[PDB]
Amino acid sequence: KVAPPIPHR
Amino acid sequence: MSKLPQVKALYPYTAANDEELSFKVGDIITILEKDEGWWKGELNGQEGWIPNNYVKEILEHHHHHH
Amino acid sequence: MSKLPQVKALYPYTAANDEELSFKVGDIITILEKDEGWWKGELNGQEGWIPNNYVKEIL
């Protein structure tokens, strides 16, 4: 249930 | 009229700044524009950029096929 | 975090062509762009032009 990291962008 | 793409939020998100759009799980967000990694969405009169890996675009039957 | 105007339909409208958006009384439409008498609206994922006298702005 972990959010992924946001797109490094 | 034309049908814009829609997405359903898989995870909640909190806008890091005023250009981004916060949302909750299950929210149905209409997409106005796609960039790399970030899409511009509209939900309940609020518009902003969202991380595109937080959402899943809903299958439609006009512009895709397999 | 930008607020878009939202409007409520006063009357039903049937789109006269493919660029217009049909709607029913009561529908709450989000406005994306304005050109004089016609405003570009979005309702349940459908986008198109509507007559601005058929709707009323929400607070």
Author numbering:
A (entry chain E): 33 to 41
B (entry chain B): -1 to 64
C (entry chain A): -1 to 57
What wording appears in the published article?
Even in simple eukaryotes like yeast and amoebazoa, myosin I exists in several isoforms, which carry out distinct functions but the genome of E. histolytica has a single isoform of myosin I, namely EhMyosin IB. EhMyosin IB has been observed to localize in phagocytic cups during erythrophagocytic processes. The SH3 domain located in the tail region of myosin I plays a prominent role in bridging the processes of actin assembly and endocytosis. In the current work, we have identified a novel interaction between the SH3 domain of unconventional EhMyosin IB and the c-terminal domain of EhFP10, and showed this interaction to regulate the phagocytic and pinocytic processes by affecting the cytoskeletal dynamics.
In a previous study, EhMySH3 was predicted to preferentially bind pseudo-symmetrical and class II ligands. Chosen ligands belonged to class I (P4), class II (P1), and an overlapping pseudo-symmetrical sequence belonging to both classes (P2), as predicted by “SH3 HUNTER’ software. The results showed that the P2 peptide, with a pseudosymmetrical ligand (overlapping class I and class II motif) from EhFP10 displayed highest binding response relative to other peptides, as was predicted in our previous study. We were able to crystallize EhMySH3 in complex with the pseudo-symmetrical peptide P2 [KVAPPIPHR]. Peptide, P2 is located between 653–661 residues in the c-terminal domain of the EhFP10 molecule. The EhMYSH3-P2 complex crystallized with two molecules of EhMySH3 and one P2 peptide per asymmetric unit, and with P2 binding to chain A of one EhMySH3 molecule and chain B of a symmetry-related EhMySH3 molecule. P2 was observed to make more electrostatic interactions with chain B than with chain A. P2 binds to EhMySH3 chain B in class II pattern, i.e., [xPxxPx(K/R)]. P2 residues A3 and P4 formed the first XP motif, which fit in the first consensus hydrophobic pocket made by residues Y9 and Y52 of EhMySH3; and I5 and P6 formed the second XP motif, which occupied the second hydrophobic pocket made by residues P49 and W36 of EhMySH3. The c-terminal residue R9 of P2 was observed to interact with residue E34 of the n-Src loop present in the specificity pocket of EhMySH3. In our case, though the electron density for the terminal R9 residue was not complete, after refinement we obtained better electron density near the n-Src loop, though there could be an alternate conformation near E18 in the RT loop, likely to be one of the probable orientations for residue R9.
